[PDB]
Amino acid sequence: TCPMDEKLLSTVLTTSYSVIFIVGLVGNIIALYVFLGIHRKRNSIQIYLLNVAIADLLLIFCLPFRIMYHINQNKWTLGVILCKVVGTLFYMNMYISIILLGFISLDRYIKINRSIQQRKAITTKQSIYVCCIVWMLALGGFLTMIILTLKKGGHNSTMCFHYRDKHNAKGEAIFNFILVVMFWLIFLLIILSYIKIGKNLLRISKRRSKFPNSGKYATTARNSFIVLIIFTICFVPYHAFRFIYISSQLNVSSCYWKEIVHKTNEIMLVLSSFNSCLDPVMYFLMSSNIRKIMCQLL
Amino acid sequence: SAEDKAAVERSKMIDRNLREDGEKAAREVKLLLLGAGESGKSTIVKQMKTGIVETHFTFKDLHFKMFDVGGQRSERKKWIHCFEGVTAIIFCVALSDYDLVLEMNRMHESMKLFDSICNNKWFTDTSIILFLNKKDLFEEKIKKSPLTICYPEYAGSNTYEEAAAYIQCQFEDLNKRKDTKEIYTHFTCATDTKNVQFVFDAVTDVIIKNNLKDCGLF
Amino acid sequence: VQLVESGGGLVQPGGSRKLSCSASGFAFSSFGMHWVRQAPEKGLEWVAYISSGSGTIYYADTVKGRFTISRDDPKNTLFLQMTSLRSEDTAMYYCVRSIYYYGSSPFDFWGQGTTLTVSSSDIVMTQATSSVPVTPGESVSISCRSSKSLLHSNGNTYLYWFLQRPGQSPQLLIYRMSNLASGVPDRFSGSGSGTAFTLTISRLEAEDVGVYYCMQHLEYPLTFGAGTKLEL
Amino acid sequence: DQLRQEAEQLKNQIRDARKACADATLSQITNNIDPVGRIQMRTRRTLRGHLAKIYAMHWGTDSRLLVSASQDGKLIIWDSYTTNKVHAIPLRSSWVMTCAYAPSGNYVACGGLDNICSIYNLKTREGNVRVSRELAGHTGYLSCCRFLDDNQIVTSSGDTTCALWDIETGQQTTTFTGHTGDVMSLSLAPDTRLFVSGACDASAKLWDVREGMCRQTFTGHESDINAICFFPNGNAFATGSDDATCRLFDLRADQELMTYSHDNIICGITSVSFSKSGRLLLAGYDDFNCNVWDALKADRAGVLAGHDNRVSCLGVTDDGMAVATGSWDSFLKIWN
Amino acid sequence: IAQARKLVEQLKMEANIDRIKVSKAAADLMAYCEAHAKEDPLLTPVPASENPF
Ligand SMILES: CCCCCCCC/C=C\CCCCCCCC(=O)OC[C@@H](COCC)OP(=O)(O)OC[C@H](N)C(=O)O
């Protein structure tokens, strides 16, 4: 081991996550309330956004367990079981949210750009099927890794979340590279969708065949870009460096190189988990009905 | 239980038939035609081509049902809710009856009826396509009849453009739910076949607005 | 209503034929269709069933895997395809309609059928006799018994009574116990319990003679009775 | 003027005579009997398949079959015991606001704003449901078709008049006139000799099916009456209007017996139906729900909690087993 | 001279009616509800053995 100073980073990592905790908890609880409480009827987008609130809600729940390690002594007092649970439950919410956000971007493409009249609101049927498929398959990956590590793996210790190389179990390291590349494919879908949505509503406002309320098209044109950009800043940095991070797990290296590689990764997750608390705010601000209610009550 | 199983299978087949019929009915536009009777709605229904009348027409690969219910001769309060959910309300107002009377002139009656329909409880998210009739007759009539006859607070020349703009603004001002829906005013033409085009543009705008509202982006 | 069959004739054994049933006079697409057969002076024996829209398909135990049941709803025509034919397939084939909902008569109309000749678990119902002489104006009682209790938990017992006059196709008389068919005289009545079933006729006339059959639905396959012939 | 004075004075003496002969209120006698307490009802079955607002329903005579009319131009016959779609009838006009089921179960007549009451024959040799006859002659929107037998049906219409028809011939046999407002509902007596109808003129009138004279009239509502039905014995009836009041009248007392209103209720009543025993009056209200009143204590003993939209129609079976409810949310719920 | 003759004739016909008092009429409904109380499945819950829903 090469344990240099990590006291100052521990404070900022603990504080940043707790800021996400307080924002995310109030963010999802209000968001969860406004998808089942006031919205008796649910559309596919209202279904997909519902699960993102649920999926991310667990991630804020994972925050108090994570911060306990950093702030007390940078040592894990609990058992290896809870360390491997929270450390793997946290990543499930990250990648369930990403795959669900790609599903929101997909329908918004087929509901706006190519849709002629409507889709009869029969997409909510397979919306639940898709969300259930994604949830169950995600749990399949969650339980699979956690048992091939807790039992098959032989290296355990008294610290959690630390930089531990993957030479002992190459399956996780190969799985991460498999898991990273599918994110970029999803990210390509999201950037392809919202760019085309913005471009299509750009030309609609350009024609201006009809004078009344043509200014909403320009607003919705920008909003298609606003939500794309926030997804791009909070997720592209992390998955761009994961290629080098994975490569560092499958080769010999000096400890100084390992530290800065470990040093960045904890900061990158601050950005990656920053989306999960900001996404409820997105729907609060973007939606006309929700924006009015929040503004008029405040 | 074999008979019960066959009954359940027949029920499932019936249900798929209703689902397909609902799919068919969900991709068609519903317009409710309204007016004061003498507002030249007959010219409108002719240009698109007892009890309640349906007019069916396909334009630009879009199927339109228009419901003319002006001949009901009953209180609107008891049957208006049956149209809660139409794509649009096509309102028609004649511009010739600013001075003509049916007591009071017909234009004020049309304004009252438009205010009643627009501010109706059941029509909150339903948009209005407004038509103004008798363009040439109204232009010719004001040459000898000042607009002060109808409106005493008006201040403008007896020209077609100023009077038309004033009438359009007066109809607009009666709307008080300006943030949810809007009034889409148009002046009727004869040989351009543009009333159908304006209706198509307005209903397309309404459809896209509903899609954007559903998607949450708007 | 008119069901007309075609495709019968004389066929060498091991050959192939196709039986067609042309429907004209009712909503064919909403009626399930049965193929039933009657051997020369032996009795009725169910062959096949195809539901509305070909959603459900059922075959008899003695033939499953040798025949093909087909439907052409656009043309209101019913098909039955035959691959292998023994000497036991020699029979008159009847094309029957059947509609299933709460209160329907699911064997209302029987086709005239066509003859097919070839060169040379299950619930069982039995009728006691095979020849009963009687004079018109005398009440006549017929009965048959089954192995299982056809009285379902629903409350209704699935028993069917058909009449076949000499030289004619069967006519549906009773479809549970006491619900008379449409176009049947009131004089017929039926009752029973569980396994024992009786049909009574008051003031019989000369046109009421023929062979009576009792059948159960309750389950597939469908089995008939032996068939009791009245004489005059 | 002379006719106005005569009408006003006649109203004066009949009002005075009816008021002076009032002995005591219904509560004044029935307060002694014990109440019913809390009635728990739960949705045993829920019916799906309509894709628009459900405007009317009617129970079958066997207490197992149903009929439902909805804004999408569909007429469905439900097997309420097993929630199976027995029949689906595509209506010619999609603007239906009432319809009913024949007491013999052979026919269903269903119409609406198109001023036509179409008759449908369910038991056809063809296998499907064909239109029997279209009854024309009403100049206003229709309401409360009600079969008397297989060949005569009484209907109300928005042209201030009700009519008795003859389905064999198709001509309006008898005309019932006198309403000074759109008649919204009518209920047949159990004996099929009399019936009552409530109109938008805030009045209810009792009519004779054979002579067609105005036998009796009832006042007390402030707004248009939208719902009405008979007491099970044929000697009383309850009306419901938009002023959030249900009232029970007696045909022989000729005056209101009891009011069924509370301060919490602000919206009117949409449907009214009675229990078999004549003690439990169910009333489907405009807001979202139905209230189950004690028809003798005027106390709401239970509420049907479903129907996320306005409830439009009620129905209580002949055997009194259950209560089917239909609402603008396109869902039928059976409560038992 | 005959615009409202039918209305006043109906009102006069509405007068000569056999008025039966409320105390004689409320008791009728009370008796009807007492006599048929036992047979209503809604006034008193029915056992699920014979309940078809
Ligand atoms: C169509 C196919 C879809 C497949 C994906 C479905 C959704 C996701 C489901 C399954 C992935 C499970 C593995 C994901 C693991 C990613 C991160 C990772 O490798 O974490 C490893 C754990 C330790 O695991 C036991 C050795 O790291 P932590 O200890 O939590 O953190 C270490 C460090 N702080 C860091 O994260 O770098």
Check if the beta carbon of residue B122 is closer than 8 Å to that of residue B81. yes
Instruction: Provide the token pair at A149.
Output: 């590590």
H/E stretch holding E24 reads helix E22-35
Exposed / middle / buried, residue D35 (Cβ in 10 Å: 0-12, 13-18, 19+): exposed
D227: nearest Cα among D265, D252, D191, D200: D200
Contact list, D92 vs chain B (CB under 8 Å): none
Contacts of A1 by beta carbon, 8 Å cutoff, 6+ apart: A255
Rounded CA-CA distance D48/D54 in Å is 11
Q: Read off φ and ψ for residue D161, nearest 5 degrees.
A: -145, 145
CA distance readout (Å), D294 to D246, D274, E33: 12, 10, 11
Report how many Cβ contacts below 8 Å link chain B to chain C: 37
Q: What b-and-e string marks burial along A82-95, b requiring 16 or more CB atoms within 10 Å of the CB?
A: ebbbbbbbbbbbbb
Question: Please, what sign has the CA dihedral across residues B63, B68, B72, B77?
Answer: positive
Rounded CA-CA distance D293/D300 in Å is 4
Check if the beta carbon of residue D297 is closer than 8 Å to that of residue D262. no
Last residue of a domain, one of C118, C138, C171: C118
Interface residue E50 vs chain D (CB under 8 A): no
Resolution (angstroms) stands at: 3.4
DSSP class of residue B87 equals: S
Rounded CA-CA distance D107/D150 in Å is 7
Chain-centroid distance, C-alpha B42: 14
Chain-centroid distance, C-alpha D169: 26
Ligand 1 atom nearest A169 alpha carbon = 26
Last residue of a domain, one of C118, C149, C178: C118
CATH code (residue E8): 4.10.260.10
CA distance readout (Å), C115 to C39, C44, C92, C94, C118: 10, 14, 4, 9, 10
DSSP class of residue B200 equals: H
Instruction: Provide the token pair at A162.
Output: 């630390």
Rounded CA-CA distance A44/B211 in Å is 12
D233: nearest Cα among D292, D276, D203: D276
- What is the maximal distance between C-alpha atoms in chain E? 69
C-alpha dihedral (D89, D91, D97, D100), degrees to nearest 10: -40
Same domain, C13 and C50: yes
Rounded CA-CA distance A225/D25 in Å is 71
Last residue of a domain, one of C53, C86, C118: C118
Instruction: Provide the token pair at D279.
Output: 């003690």
Check if the beta carbon of residue C66 is closer than 8 Å to that of residue C81. no
Q: What b-and-e string marks burial along A55-80, b requiring 16 or more CB atoms within 10 Å of the CB?
A: bbbbbbbbbebbbebbeeebebeeee
DSSP B9-60: HHHHHHHHHHHHHHHHHHTSEEEEEE--SSSSHHHHHHHH----EEEEEEET
For chain D, the first-to-last Cα distance in angstroms comes to 58
Contacts of D103 by beta carbon, 8 Å cutoff, 6+ apart: D61, D147, D148, D149
- Ligand 1 pocket test, pick from A82, A163, A179 with the greatest ligand atom count within 8 Å of Cβ, gives A179
Check if the beta carbon of residue D248 is closer than 8 Å to that of residue D291. no
Question: Please, what sign has the CA dihedral across residues B194, B197, B203, B206?
Answer: negative
Rounded CA-CA distance D180/D168 in Å is 31
Check if the beta carbon of residue C151 is closer than 8 Å to that of residue C191. no
Rounded CA-CA distance B133/B34 in Å is 13
C163: nearest Cα among C138, C137, C145, C190: C190
Inspect the interface and report whether the beta carbons of B214 and A219 lie closer than 8 Å: no
Q: Binding site membership of B for Mg(2+): which residues?
A: 42
**Beta-strand relationship, D43-47 and C140-146:** unpaired
- Would you call the peptide bond into C106 cis, given omega within 30 degrees of 0 as the criterion? no
**What angle, rounded to 10 degrees, do the helices at B160-173 and B106-118 form?**
40
Check if the beta carbon of residue A147 is closer than 8 Å to that of residue A230. no
Give the chains touching C; criterion: ≥3 Cβ pairs < 8 Å: B, D
Name the β-bridge partners of D194: D208
Same domain, C71 and C26: yes
Inspect the interface and report whether the beta carbons of B18 and D224 lie closer than 8 Å: no
Cα of A176 from ligand 1 centre, angstroms: 7
Q: What angle do CA B4, B9, B13 make, to 5 degrees?
A: 145
Instruction: Provide the token pair at D70.
Output: 């909805």
Chain-centroid distance, C-alpha D243: 17
DSSP class of residue D264 equals: S
Contacts of D123 by beta carbon, 8 Å cutoff, 6+ apart: C182, D106
Q: What b-and-e string marks burial along D91-107, b requiring 16 or more CB atoms within 10 Å of the CB?
A: bebbbbbbbbbbbebeb
If one counts the domains in chain E, the total is 1
If one counts the domains in chain C, the total is 2
Instruction: Provide the token pair at D200.
Output: 């938008």
D43: nearest Cα among E53, E43, B11, E44: E53
Same domain, C164 and C75: no
E5: nearest Cα among D7, C203, D57: D7
Check if the beta carbon of residue D74 is closer than 8 Å to that of residue D88. yes
DSSP D182-233: -EEEEEE-TTSSEEEEEETTTEEEEEETTT--EEEEEE--SS-EEEEEE-TT
Q: What b-and-e string marks burial along D264-303, b requiring 16 or more CB atoms within 10 Å of the CB?
A: ebeebbbbbbbbbbbbbbbbbbbebbbbbbbbbbbebbbe
DSSP C124-145: -EEES-SEEE--TTS-EEEEEE
Taken in order of first residue, the domains within chain D and their CATH numbers are 2-335 (2.130.10.10)
Interface residue B10 vs chain C (CB under 8 A): yes
Question: Coil, helix or strand for C184?
Answer: coil
Rounded CA-CA distance A145/A172 in Å is 8
The count of other CB atoms within 10 Å of the CB of residue D85 is: 23
Check if the beta carbon of residue A182 is closer than 8 Å to that of residue A97. no
CA distance readout (Å), A22 to A67, A72, A87, A274: 13, 20, 20, 12
Same domain, C61 and C133: no
Interface residue D94 vs chain E (CB under 8 A): no
Instruction: Provide the token pair at A213.
Output: 């309320």
Taken in order of first residue, the domains within chain A and their CATH numbers are 7-288 (1.20.1070.10)
Check if the beta carbon of residue D136 is closer than 8 Å to that of residue D94. no
Instruction: Provide the token pair at B137.
Output: 């007759």
Rounded CA-CA distance D53/B82 in Å is 9
Cα of A179 from ligand 1 centre, angstroms: 9
Rounded CA-CA distance B106/A202 in Å is 43
Name the β-bridge partners of D208: D194
Same domain, C18 and C112: yes
Beta-sheet strand order (sheet of C228-231):
C131-133, C228-231, C211-216, C159-164, C171-174
Rounded CA-CA distance C31/C37 in Å is 19
C-alpha dihedral (B38, B39, B45, B47), degrees to nearest 10: 120
Check if the beta carbon of residue C33 is closer than 8 Å to that of residue C93. no
Task: State the SS3 of B138-193.
Answer: HHHHCCCCCHHHCCCCCCCCCCHHHHHHHHHHHHHHCCCCCCCCCEEEEECCCCCC
Check if the beta carbon of residue C47 is closer than 8 Å to that of residue C109. no
Same domain, C49 and C77: yes
Contacts of B49 by beta carbon, 8 Å cutoff, 6+ apart: B55, B57
Same domain, C13 and C114: yes
C29: nearest Cα among C93, C94, C99: C99
What number of residues does chain D have? 336
Check if the beta carbon of residue C92 is closer than 8 Å to that of residue C117. no
The count of other CB atoms within 10 Å of the CB of residue C188 is: 19
Check if the beta carbon of residue C27 is closer than 8 Å to that of residue C19. no
CA distance readout (Å), C51 to B13, C97, C162, C174, D315: 11, 10, 21, 22, 34
Name the β-bridge partners of D78: D66, D85
Beta-sheet strand order (sheet of B127-133):
B53-59, B62-68, B29-34, B88-94, B127-133, B183-187
For chain C, the first-to-last Cα distance in angstroms comes to 31
Name the β-bridge partners of B156: none
Identify the experimental approach: cryo-EM
DSSP chain A: ------HHHHHHHHHHHHHHHHHHHHHHHHHHHHHHTS-SS--HHHHHHHHHHHHHHHHHHHHHHHHHHHHHTSS--S-HHHHHHHHHHHHHHHHHHHHHHHHHHHHHHHHHTS-SS--TT-HHHHHHHHHHHHHHHHHHHHHHHHHHHHTS-----S--S----SSS-HHHHHHHHHHHHHHHHHHHHHHHHHHHHHHHHHHHHHH--S-TT-HHHHHHHHHHHHHHHHHHHHHHHHHHHHHHHHHHHTS---HHHHHHHHHHHHHHHHHHHHHHHHHHHHHHHH-HHHHHHHHHH-
C-alpha dihedral (D323, D327, D329, D335), degrees to nearest 10: -10
Domain range for E38: 1-53
Question: Coil, helix or strand for C167?
Answer: coil
Q: What angle do CA D141, D142, D146 make, to 5 degrees?
A: 175
D60: nearest Cα among D120, D106, D111, D97: D106
Name the β-bridge partners of D204: D198, D218
Contacts of D55 by beta carbon, 8 Å cutoff, 6+ apart: D69, D70, D71, D96, D97, D98, D112, D312, D313
Rounded CA-CA distance D253/E24 in Å is 8
Rg of chain D on CA atoms, in Å: 20
D60: nearest Cα among D322, D327, D331, D333: D322
CA distance readout (Å), E53 to D42, D43, D45, D225, D317: 10, 9, 7, 33, 13
Rounded CA-CA distance C5/C15 in Å is 20
B10: nearest Cα among A278, C53, A13, D207: C53
Rounded CA-CA distance A106/A187 in Å is 11
Name the β-bridge partners of D269: D285
Q: Which residues line ligand 1 (CB under 6 A)?
A: A 84, 87-88, 91-92, 95, 138, 141-142, 145, 149, 161, 172, 175-176, 179, 265
Check if the beta carbon of residue A31 is closer than 8 Å to that of residue A280. yes
Residues preceding chain discontinuities in chain A with C to N over 2.5 Å: none
DSSP D30-89: HTTS---------EEEEE----S-EEEEEE-TTSSEEEEEETTTEEEEEETTTTEEEEEE
Same domain, C113 and C131: no
CA distance readout (Å), B10 to A168, B60, C100, D293: 61, 38, 7, 39
B13: nearest Cα among C27, C52, C50: C52
Rounded CA-CA distance C149/C196 in Å is 9
Question: Please, what sign has the CA dihedral across residues C72, C75, C77, C83?
Answer: negative
Name the β-bridge partners of B133: B94
D132: nearest Cα among D95, D175, D170: D170
- What is the maximal distance between C-alpha atoms in chain D? 65
Rounded CA-CA distance A246/A177 in Å is 7
C55: nearest Cα among C71, C67, C68, C74: C71
Inspect the interface and report whether the beta carbons of C102 and D123 lie closer than 8 Å: no
> Nearest residue of B to residue C151 by CA position?
B1
Question: Please, what sign has the CA dihedral across residues B167, B169, B174, B175?
Answer: positive
Q: Per CATH, which fold does B1-218 belong to? A: Rossmann fold (3.40.50)
The count of other CB atoms within 10 Å of the CB of residue A14 is: 18
Domain range for C104: 3-118
C95: nearest Cα among C24, C163, C41, C177: C24
Strands (E), chain C: 3-6, 9-11, 17-23, 32-39, 43-50, 57-59, 67-72, 77-82, 91-98, 114-118, 125-127, 131-133, 140-146, 159-164, 171-174, 188-193, 196-201, 211-216, 228-231
Rounded CA-CA distance D157/D160 in Å is 6
Cα of A144 from ligand 1 centre, angstroms: 11
Compute the nearest-CA separation of D64 from chain C (Å).
10
Same domain, C49 and C73: yes
**CA-proximal residue: ligand 1, atom 31 (nearest):** A161
Rg of chain A on CA atoms, in Å: 21
Inspect the interface and report whether the beta carbons of D140 and B17 lie closer than 8 Å: no
Helices and strands counted in chain C (H then E): 0, 19
The count of other CB atoms within 10 Å of the CB of residue C40 is: 9
D323: nearest Cα among D124, D75, D66, D139: D66
